[PDB]
Each structure stands twice: as C-alpha cells, then as structure tokens.
Design a protein around this nucleic acid. Structure first.
Ligand SMILES: [Zn+2]
Length: 348
DNA sequence: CGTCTTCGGCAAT
DNA sequence: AAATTGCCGAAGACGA
C-alpha cells in the first residue's frame, strides 16, 4: 500500500535539530582526530571521506550512526589478489611514509591498524567520547548517543583492479560516460581479513562511488531536482533499510539476522536500479510497486544465495562462507511473511 | 515553496 | 610545498 508506505517514510524522516546537534558532535570529534593524525609521519596524507547512509541521505529514524573513512593517498601501489577472492588484496609498493608498516614486501594491515587505533584511542582519552575484522578499525560513542565507525583506508589513484571491470553495470541507467568518469576516480582499500583468517589483506572499497550514485541517481540529470521528477529510489532504499532494521530488532534474540547489514540492502538496491534504469520505473505514484521490486529482488538474492558486490561481480556477499543458508532462509521466510501481511514490522 | 542547515570540492591560501 | 580554509549551492527538514 503506497499510502501506508508514505506514512512509514514520514516517521523515518530525521529531525533537523537532531542532525544539527549530531553533526556538530561528530564533526568536532572527527576534526580533532584528523588534526592529530596529520601530525604523525605515517598518516601524513590522511583525509576525510564521509561514507554510508547519513552522507547518502538514506539515514532513517535518527542521525545516530555515522560512518567515516580516514583515507591515505599511497603512492605506486601494487596489488596482489589474495587467493581468488576478487576483493581481497595484499598491498605492495613499486622511501615512503608507510615503510614502517611493511612486513617483508607487503603492507601490514595489522601493523597499520594498530598504530591507527593507538593514536585514536589516545586522542579520545582526552576528549565526552569513548572508543569501542579490521574495518571499521574503531567505533566511537559520543555522549552515549552517537556512534561513529571509523575506517582506515588506502587511496589508490591507479585504475581499478581487473575484478571490477565487469562491475558497476550502470551503462543503461547512469550512462557509459558516467561509468567512465566514476572509474577514473580513486579506489580504496580497507584493512579486512579474508576467511582461518589471512590477517594482512585489504578489501576494495567504493563507498565514495556509492555515495556519488545515490546523490546523482537518475537516468535524467534533473531527477529529484524539481517537483515533476521526484523519483522514489531513496524512498525504497530507506524502506528496505527499515524493513531489515525492524526485522533485525524483532528477532534480535535469535541470531539469524546478525550478519545482514544496510550494505546488503544498499547493494541489492543498486542491482534493482540496474534492472530498472528508467526514472519512470521509480515514479512516486508507484512507491508500492517499486518497493516490491526491491523486496522481490532481495528475496531472490536470499533464495539463490547470490548478492553480487555491485563493483566486484564475482564477490558474492551472500556466499555460504559469509552467511549461513539457515540465516538466509530465515530472512526469506520473515520477509515473505511481512509482505503477505502489509508489513507488520513497519508499525511496531 | 521559501528558509534554514549541512556537506563536498576546490581555488586561494 | 602542499595541506588548510572559506565559500558556493544542492539536498532535505520544516513551517507557512
Ligand atoms: Zn530521483
């Protein structure tokens, strides 16, 4: 029902005053940490890349969860793919400020993460904030209300790795030209061990690209810039995130839904966007149909145990090695029930 | 639909 | 030398 769904979206709208106070807290702490990190020889080129739901304007309910990336431009990077995981890599260099973190010829994520956490932990000790598989490296809690997931990332301005070359299938949606422009942007490597865990791997990150697409998301260049062209893409993504968040809350005592994340819902949403490239397939009048497309596609991913990373097609976020069949069957069952009953979890 | 706020990029430092 | 900073305007909450 499109009218019930719109009522859900109204309840999900963030408070402008809450945004204001929350942003003030996050920005103060983040700037404090960046200022400290830039004083260290190792994190000399550190910069802020804001990522995730809040900076994509798909944060729901309250602005109480911020993801930030502390990125380091690194020179002359040489990637070695770990096994054939397609997303995990050993970092090498082709005399540089990260030489202390080298363990042989590979860059030690562990060594780097340790100094990163150490510096942040020390800086938080003097601030009302507290510190709490490598990425996010650190989670802050500001005034018991606001959580900040801080991810260390290497920035490579090199062309994207070969495993991405069939990814980002935006050609018929955002255009081949936009795909070419996005793939000229840097890519990021975050410390993330690969599963026995290889503790020195880095995973490809494209959070900046994900943010760019979401804030410039139409086939039409003027999508959502005027009244006539307000699509429901972000509305559906928010509904999908609320659906997952509510299901995860409703079954928090069970453990089946713990591994599912907003990134899964966001990734699925980008695939539905690829399957539905035209803004007219996201008309505001069709919020119900569009949400059901997202729900249906997500259920297909659960059932087939395939949710491709939007950028790395052979990296299956729903692989057996990542999420148990039983966890997907459980989500499938609950989503199917939810849909068959006008989504009871939305009222709560 | 105008007002207000926040964020992102980047000349100008 | 190269990291810092102020400024612009889109995005979105909000009230009228
Ligand atoms: Zn739009």
């Amino acid at each position: 029902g499109a009218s019930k769904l719109r009522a859900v979206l109204e309840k999900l709208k963030l408070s402008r005053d809450d945004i204001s106070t929350a942003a003030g807290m996050v920005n103060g702490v983040v700037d404090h940490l960046l200022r400290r990190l830039k004083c260290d020889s190792a994190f000399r080129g550190v910069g802020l890349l804001n990522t995730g739901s809040y900076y994509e304007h798909v944060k729901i309910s309250a602005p109480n969860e911020f993801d930030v990336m502390f990125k380091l431009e690194v020179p002359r990077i040489q990637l070695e793919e770990y096994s054939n995981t397609r997303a995990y890599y050993f970092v090498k260099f082709k005399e540089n400020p990260l030489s202390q973190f080298l363990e042989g010829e590979i860059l030690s994520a562990s060594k780097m993460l340790s100094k990163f956490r150490k510096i942040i932990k020390e800086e938080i000790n003097d601030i009302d904030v507290i510190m709490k598989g490598g990425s996010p490296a650190v989670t802050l809690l500001i005034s018991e209300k606001i959580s900040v997931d801080i991810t260390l990332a290497l920035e490579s301005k090199s062309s994207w790795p070969a495993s991405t070359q069939e990814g980002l299938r935006i050609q018929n949606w955002l255009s081949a030209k936009v795909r070419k422009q996005l793939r000229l942007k840097p890519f990021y490597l975050v410390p993330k061990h690969a599963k026995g865990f290889q503790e020195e791997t880095w995973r490809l990150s494209f959070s900046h690209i994900e943010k760019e697409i979401l804030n410039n998301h139409g086939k039409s260049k003027t999508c959502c810039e005027n009244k006539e062209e307000k699509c429901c893409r972000k509305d559906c993504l928010k509904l999908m995130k609320y659906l997952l968040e509510q299901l995860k809350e409703r079954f928090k005592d069970k453990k089946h839904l713990d591994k599912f994340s907003s990134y899964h819902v966001k990734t699925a949403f980008f695939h539905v966007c690829t399957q539905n490239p035209q803004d007219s397939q996201w008309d505001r009048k069709d919020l119900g149909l569009c949400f059901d497309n997202c729900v249906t596609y997500f259920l297909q991913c659960l059932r087939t145990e395939k949710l491709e990373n939007y950028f790395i097609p052979e990296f299956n976020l729903f692989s057996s090695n990542l999420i148990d069949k039983r966890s997907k069957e459980f989500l499938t069952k609950q989503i199917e029930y939810e849909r068959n009953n006008e989504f009871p979890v939305f009222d709560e």
